[PDB]
C-alpha cells in the first residue's frame, strides 16, 4: 500500500481495522490527494469494485482450487497434530519400503527424521 503524502509501504493484513472510516480520516485522505495532485476513484469503477467483491464473496470454489488452497496452507502449516500423525505414518510406510528394499542408507535418515519429529508428551 502507499499513503499519498508518504511513500510506499508493505504491510501485513492484520494491521487493518474492522472499524469504518471516519469523516476526518477521509477528509485528510482527500487533502493528501489534492496535495499530491491525484483524483478520487470514479463511481463506475466503484461499482465495478463492488460487483467484483460480491462475485468473489459469492463464488463457489472448485475442487482444484480447494486443493491448491489446502496445499498452500499446509506449506504455511507450522504444526498440527492430525497432520503430524499422518506424516509419521507416511514416514513409517517409507521406512518399511526402504527396509524391504535392503537400503541401509535411506533407513538411517528416515529413523533420524522420525526421532526428531517424535518424542511426544
Amino acid at each position: 500500500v502507499a499513503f499519498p503524502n508518504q511513500k510506499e509501504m508493505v504491510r501485513p493484513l492484520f494491521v487493518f481495522s474492522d472499524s469504518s472510516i471516519t469523516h476526518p480520516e477521509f477528509d485528510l485522505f482527500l487533502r493528501e490527494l489534492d496535495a499530491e495532485g491525484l483524483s478520487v476513484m470514479d463511481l463506475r469503477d466503484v461499482d465495478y469494485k463492488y460487483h467484483q467483491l460480491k462475485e468473489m464473496s459469492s463464488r463457489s470454489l472448485s475442487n482444484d482450487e480447494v486443493n491448491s488452497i489446502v496445499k498452500m496452507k499446509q506449506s504455511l502449516s507450522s504444526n498440527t497434530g492430525f497432520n503430524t500423525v499422518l506424516k509419521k505414518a507416511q514416514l513409517q510406510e517409507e521406512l518399511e519400503e526402504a527396509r524391504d528394499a535392503h537400503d541401509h542408507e535411506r533407513v538411517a535418515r528416515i529413523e533420524a527424521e522420525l526421532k526428531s519429529i517424535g518424542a511426544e508428551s
Binding site: 469504518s20 472510516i21 469523516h23 476513484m41 470514479d42 463511481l43 466503484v46 463492488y50 467483491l53
Partner: peptide
C-alpha cells in the same frame, strides 16, 4: 466520472475477518 461519496466507499468495506 462522478466523485465517490462516503457511502460508496462504505459499500466496499472489506474487514480483517473478511480478509482472513
Amino acid at each position: 466520472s462522478k466523485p465517490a461519496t462516503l457511502s460508496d466507499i462504505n459499500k466496499i468495506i472489506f474487514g480483517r475477518t473478511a480478509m482472513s
